[PDB]
Scaffold this motif. Sequence first.
Motif, PDB file in Angstrom:
ATOM      1  N   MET A 134     -30.576   5.948  29.943  1.00  0.00           N
ATOM      2  CA  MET A 134     -31.478   4.888  29.690  1.00  0.00           C
ATOM      3  C   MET A 134     -31.283   3.351  30.338  1.00  0.00           C
ATOM      4  O   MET A 134     -32.165   2.746  30.685  1.00  0.00           O
ATOM      5  CB  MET A 134     -31.477   4.790  28.073  1.00  0.00           C
ATOM      6  N   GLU A 135     -30.155   3.158  30.784  1.00  0.00           N
ATOM      7  CA  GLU A 135     -29.538   1.884  31.444  1.00  0.00           C
ATOM      8  C   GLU A 135     -28.121   2.192  31.822  1.00  0.00           C
ATOM      9  O   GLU A 135     -27.567   3.197  31.547  1.00  0.00           O
ATOM     10  CB  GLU A 135     -29.937   0.765  30.607  1.00  0.00           C
ATOM     11  N   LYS A 136     -27.964   1.175  32.677  1.00  0.00           N
ATOM     12  CA  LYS A 136     -26.650   1.329  33.434  1.00  0.00           C
ATOM     13  C   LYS A 136     -26.102  -0.210  33.683  1.00  0.00           C
ATOM     14  O   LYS A 136     -26.904  -1.150  33.819  1.00  0.00           O
ATOM     15  CB  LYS A 136     -26.547   2.045  34.565  1.00  0.00           C
ATOM     16  N   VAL A 137     -24.936  -0.559  33.672  1.00  0.00           N
ATOM     17  CA  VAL A 137     -24.123  -1.689  33.940  1.00  0.00           C
ATOM     18  C   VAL A 137     -23.122  -1.309  34.541  1.00  0.00           C
ATOM     19  O   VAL A 137     -22.301  -0.604  34.566  1.00  0.00           O
ATOM     20  CB  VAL A 137     -24.167  -2.472  32.594  1.00  0.00           C
ATOM     21  N   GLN A 138     -22.562  -2.394  35.476  1.00  0.00           N
ATOM     22  CA  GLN A 138     -21.419  -2.677  36.498  1.00  0.00           C
ATOM     23  C   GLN A 138     -20.623  -3.423  35.676  1.00  0.00           C
ATOM     24  O   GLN A 138     -21.041  -4.744  35.382  1.00  0.00           O
ATOM     25  CB  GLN A 138     -21.456  -2.753  37.914  1.00  0.00           C
ATOM     26  N   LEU A 139     -19.761  -3.247  35.232  1.00  0.00           N
ATOM     27  CA  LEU A 139     -18.356  -4.151  34.382  1.00  0.00           C
ATOM     28  C   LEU A 139     -17.451  -4.524  35.361  1.00  0.00           C
ATOM     29  O   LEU A 139     -16.298  -3.427  35.797  1.00  0.00           O
ATOM     30  CB  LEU A 139     -17.983  -3.482  33.168  1.00  0.00           C
ATOM     31  N   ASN A 140     -17.021  -5.673  35.746  1.00  0.00           N
ATOM     32  CA  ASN A 140     -15.790  -6.058  36.358  1.00  0.00           C
ATOM     33  C   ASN A 140     -14.803  -6.725  35.441  1.00  0.00           C
ATOM     34  O   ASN A 140     -15.088  -7.413  34.595  1.00  0.00           O
ATOM     35  CB  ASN A 140     -16.259  -7.033  37.329  1.00  0.00           C
ATOM     36  N   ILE A 141     -13.594  -5.772  35.021  1.00  0.00           N
ATOM     37  CA  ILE A 141     -12.575  -6.431  34.434  1.00  0.00           C
ATOM     38  C   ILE A 141     -12.481  -7.640  34.421  1.00  0.00           C
ATOM     39  O   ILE A 141     -11.918  -8.393  33.305  1.00  0.00           O
ATOM     40  CB  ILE A 141     -11.537  -5.407  34.326  1.00  0.00           C
ATOM     41  N   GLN A 142     -12.284  -8.430  35.642  1.00  0.00           N
ATOM     42  CA  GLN A 142     -12.292  -9.789  35.392  1.00  0.00           C
ATOM     43  C   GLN A 142     -13.212 -10.662  34.948  1.00  0.00           C
ATOM     44  O   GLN A 142     -12.853 -11.573  34.457  1.00  0.00           O
ATOM     45  CB  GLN A 142     -11.909 -10.101  37.042  1.00  0.00           C
ATOM     46  N   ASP A 143     -14.532 -10.041  34.781  1.00  0.00           N
ATOM     47  CA  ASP A 143     -15.277 -10.855  33.907  1.00  0.00           C
ATOM     48  C   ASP A 143     -15.088 -10.942  32.565  1.00  0.00           C
ATOM     49  O   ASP A 143     -15.196 -11.784  31.656  1.00  0.00           O
ATOM     50  CB  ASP A 143     -16.859 -10.458  34.174  1.00  0.00           C
ATOM     51  N   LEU A 144     -14.406  -9.764  32.005  1.00  0.00           N
ATOM     52  CA  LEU A 144     -13.996  -9.382  30.768  1.00  0.00           C
ATOM     53  C   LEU A 144     -13.027 -10.412  30.533  1.00  0.00           C
ATOM     54  O   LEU A 144     -12.616 -11.045  29.169  1.00  0.00           O
ATOM     55  CB  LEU A 144     -13.765  -7.851  30.485  1.00  0.00           C
ATOM     56  N   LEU A 145     -12.045 -10.630  31.296  1.00  0.00           N
ATOM     57  CA  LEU A 145     -10.693 -11.285  31.295  1.00  0.00           C
ATOM     58  C   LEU A 145     -11.114 -12.880  30.999  1.00  0.00           C
ATOM     59  O   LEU A 145     -10.482 -13.650  30.370  1.00  0.00           O
ATOM     60  CB  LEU A 145      -9.773 -11.172  32.382  1.00  0.00           C
ATOM     61  N   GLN A 146     -12.338 -13.136  31.870  1.00  0.00           N
ATOM     62  CA  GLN A 146     -12.664 -14.337  31.733  1.00  0.00           C
ATOM     63  C   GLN A 146     -13.225 -14.719  30.314  1.00  0.00           C
ATOM     64  O   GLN A 146     -12.802 -15.821  29.712  1.00  0.00           O
ATOM     65  CB  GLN A 146     -13.811 -14.929  32.763  1.00  0.00           C
ATOM     66  N   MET A 147     -13.642 -14.034  29.782  1.00  0.00           N
ATOM     67  CA  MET A 147     -14.262 -13.778  28.175  1.00  0.00           C
ATOM     68  C   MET A 147     -13.136 -14.053  27.419  1.00  0.00           C
ATOM     69  O   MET A 147     -13.138 -14.828  26.539  1.00  0.00           O
ATOM     70  CB  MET A 147     -14.845 -12.815  27.888  1.00  0.00           C
ATOM     71  N   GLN A 148     -11.993 -13.073  27.512  1.00  0.00           N
ATOM     72  CA  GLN A 148     -10.576 -13.265  26.807  1.00  0.00           C
ATOM     73  C   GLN A 148     -10.303 -14.568  26.616  1.00  0.00           C
ATOM     74  O   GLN A 148      -9.606 -15.042  25.761  1.00  0.00           O
ATOM     75  CB  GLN A 148      -9.838 -11.930  27.338  1.00  0.00           C
ATOM     76  N   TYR A 149     -10.620 -15.424  27.966  1.00  0.00           N
ATOM     77  CA  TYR A 149     -10.269 -16.833  28.223  1.00  0.00           C
ATOM     78  C   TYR A 149     -11.043 -18.068  27.542  1.00  0.00           C
ATOM     79  O   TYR A 149     -10.663 -19.193  27.474  1.00  0.00           O
ATOM     80  CB  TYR A 149     -10.058 -17.248  29.572  1.00  0.00           C
ATOM     81  N   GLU A 150     -12.514 -17.661  27.354  1.00  0.00           N
ATOM     82  CA  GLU A 150     -13.197 -18.675  26.373  1.00  0.00           C
ATOM     83  C   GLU A 150     -12.755 -18.194  25.020  1.00  0.00           C
ATOM     84  O   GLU A 150     -13.200 -19.232  24.255  1.00  0.00           O
ATOM     85  CB  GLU A 150     -14.573 -18.456  26.912  1.00  0.00           C
ATOM     86  N   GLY A 151     -11.785 -17.452  25.050  1.00  0.00           N
ATOM     87  CA  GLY A 151     -11.317 -17.063  23.512  1.00  0.00           C
ATOM     88  C   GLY A 151     -12.592 -15.998  22.840  1.00  0.00           C
ATOM     89  O   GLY A 151     -12.783 -16.257  21.654  1.00  0.00           O
ATOM     90  N   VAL A 152     -13.534 -15.330  23.555  1.00  0.00           N
ATOM     91  CA  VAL A 152     -14.647 -14.492  23.074  1.00  0.00           C
ATOM     92  C   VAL A 152     -14.012 -13.255  22.820  1.00  0.00           C
ATOM     93  O   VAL A 152     -13.394 -12.509  23.755  1.00  0.00           O
ATOM     94  CB  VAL A 152     -15.646 -14.456  24.209  1.00  0.00           C
ATOM     95  N   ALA A 153     -14.456 -12.794  21.458  1.00  0.00           N
ATOM     96  CA  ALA A 153     -14.080 -11.569  20.835  1.00  0.00           C
ATOM     97  C   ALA A 153     -15.044 -10.530  21.196  1.00  0.00           C
ATOM     98  O   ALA A 153     -14.532  -9.167  21.316  1.00  0.00           O
ATOM     99  CB  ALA A 153     -13.723 -11.683  19.674  1.00  0.00           C
ATOM    100  N   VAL A 154     -16.200 -10.529  21.575  1.00  0.00           N
ATOM    101  CA  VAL A 154     -17.319  -9.631  21.378  1.00  0.00           C
ATOM    102  C   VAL A 154     -18.156 -10.226  22.699  1.00  0.00           C
ATOM    103  O   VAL A 154     -18.559 -11.134  22.981  1.00  0.00           O
ATOM    104  CB  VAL A 154     -17.797  -9.698  20.295  1.00  0.00           C
ATOM    105  N   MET A 155     -19.057  -9.039  23.165  1.00  0.00           N
ATOM    106  CA  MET A 155     -19.975  -9.061  24.316  1.00  0.00           C
ATOM    107  C   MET A 155     -21.004  -8.147  24.106  1.00  0.00           C
ATOM    108  O   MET A 155     -20.722  -7.270  23.186  1.00  0.00           O
ATOM    109  CB  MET A 155     -19.319  -9.012  25.587  1.00  0.00           C
ATOM    110  N   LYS A 156     -22.181  -8.314  24.769  1.00  0.00           N
ATOM    111  CA  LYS A 156     -23.117  -7.466  24.628  1.00  0.00           C
ATOM    112  C   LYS A 156     -23.303  -6.640  26.064  1.00  0.00           C
ATOM    113  O   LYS A 156     -23.770  -7.150  26.878  1.00  0.00           O
ATOM    114  CB  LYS A 156     -24.542  -8.014  24.443  1.00  0.00           C
ATOM    115  N   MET A 157     -22.710  -5.296  26.086  1.00  0.00           N
ATOM    116  CA  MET A 157     -22.503  -4.744  27.189  1.00  0.00           C
ATOM    117  C   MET A 157     -24.073  -4.226  27.669  1.00  0.00           C
ATOM    118  O   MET A 157     -24.150  -3.792  28.988  1.00  0.00           O
ATOM    119  CB  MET A 157     -21.648  -3.449  26.966  1.00  0.00           C
ATOM    120  N   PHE A 158     -24.804  -4.101  26.528  1.00  0.00           N
ATOM    121  CA  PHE A 158     -26.156  -3.776  26.828  1.00  0.00           C
ATOM    122  C   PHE A 158     -26.686  -4.731  25.908  1.00  0.00           C
ATOM    123  O   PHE A 158     -26.160  -4.966  25.002  1.00  0.00           O
ATOM    124  CB  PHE A 158     -26.436  -2.124  26.848  1.00  0.00           C
TER     125      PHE A 158
END
Length: 94
Positions: A54-78
Amino acid sequence: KPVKYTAAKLHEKGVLLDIDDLQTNQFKNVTFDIIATEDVGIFDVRSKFLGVEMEKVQLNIQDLLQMQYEGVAVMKMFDKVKVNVNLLIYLLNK
């Protein structure tokens, strides 16, 4: 070689929080394939519903690490799929 997880398994584990507009009795019908790419930091994630991509996303672990630095616990992967950042990074690195 995809690694496959059902939405229900990811929900049990805490990686997945919720899928908007999906009854929890339909989580079994959602499967995520996580596929390595030619970049060590980047994963190709396909979202399937009753076997259909139904859908696809490319996830770069460094974008996730940047989130872990705004102190963000959750994201919308889709746009509808809420996931836990720290647990997802661990999953992708496993």
